[PDB]
């Protein structure tokens, strides 16, 4: 067989395509609060779930999904909100590297994003970022590759916006990213966190995350799916 | 034998007066970025680790210990800052409910600290805490029981202890507390959450952390110790 696949979502519209994209037999199996669907596509084992919103239950998910199922790699694929005017609703990006933008130990003088004993941003599979865009350029789509900026907040004004660009020149902001991609690194895992614009994180981003969720979870699913049938 | 219990602290410094009280034989086991010091006190077996800083290390962690080491029940000790006027440097409390402060899913109209599919508030083992109240009147010394406040900002301002205690009456703050009994409630796996004062969450609050870091988790470390020996 293939190596096992983690595939990740944060809400159940972001995994709902995945499941129904890939089309075979899937198994529940609850742990942790969470629902993995484990099946099997072109000789590969797959678990897919969606993790919840947010730092916490996206590493409490991830984690499971490494320590419980072994999983070998981790692909995530979900909407985000745009930081940069080349990014449009529905286009896709891959995150180069990520980072916890609402961290802030800076009472001991370090720099926003910085833990002791840990860094600012996390690295991604170059691999499967490398992947991702000769598929990108096959199928004629764009895809950024970009700095994906992650924390607890749904971000929806100018002054943040700012301050994540102007921080940490991030291209998309979201609240899930880092953490899995966290988790990956500290066990050894590769991962690629794949994202779909659904909103501009501005005033108005709270009314175009809802008119467009559907649309921009079924672009990041199908270009998910794609990546898979390249592995 | 007795029920596994895990042990977690977030800086080394909290779980090196841990390692010494116990006094046993430490086996150093790695996984996911931590240490897990495992060994064996009056018949039970304890699991020991440090998380580093912050929500998404110390749910890594917390996950890891249920998961890979099949822990019963999970103890925390460590320091936090005061945000009520009776809890002074070194004072005790264990939380009985604890809030993610920094969560904001507003721009749906959800109150703050919610998520979807979740809930503002965590609950922890009452049976732990009441064990803690009974040792600590029998020690003769105060403990608190109240709501502790989680986020990944070190907190020293004025402004965002009013907030604390306004939207949450929070009597605490800190930055692993909420996750990881989260993690906790999510397996089904009983928590207690104790944490010692060394600050006071206000502008000096930096200096104060630095200057009764020691002694205040050796405070934490010895009560955390003294309600090992009645499980
Ligand atoms: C309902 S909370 C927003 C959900 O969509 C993603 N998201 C999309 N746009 C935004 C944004 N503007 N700010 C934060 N997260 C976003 C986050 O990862 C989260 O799972
Ligand atoms: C060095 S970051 C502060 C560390 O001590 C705890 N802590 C103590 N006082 C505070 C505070 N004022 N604000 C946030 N966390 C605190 C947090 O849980 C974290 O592990
Ligand atoms: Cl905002
Ligand atoms: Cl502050």
Known sequence: ????????????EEITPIL????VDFEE????????????????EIIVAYSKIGKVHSTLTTTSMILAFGVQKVLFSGVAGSLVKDLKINDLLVA??????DVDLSAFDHPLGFIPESAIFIETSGSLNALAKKIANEQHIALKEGVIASGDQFVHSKERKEFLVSEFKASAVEMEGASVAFVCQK????????????????????MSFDEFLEKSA???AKFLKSMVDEL
């Open 1 to 12: 067989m293939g190596q096992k696949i983690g595939i990740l979502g944060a809400m159940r």
């Open 20 to 23: 129904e994209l890939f089309g």
């Open 29 to 44: 199996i609850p742990l942790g609060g969470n629902v993995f669907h484990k099946g099997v596509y072109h000789n590969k």
């Open 96 to 101: 180069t590297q990520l980072v916890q933008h």
């Open 187 to 206: 066990f050894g895992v590769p991962c690629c966190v794949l994202r779909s614009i659904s909103n501009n994180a501005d005033e108005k981003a709270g």
């Open 218 to 220: 079924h672009t990041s």
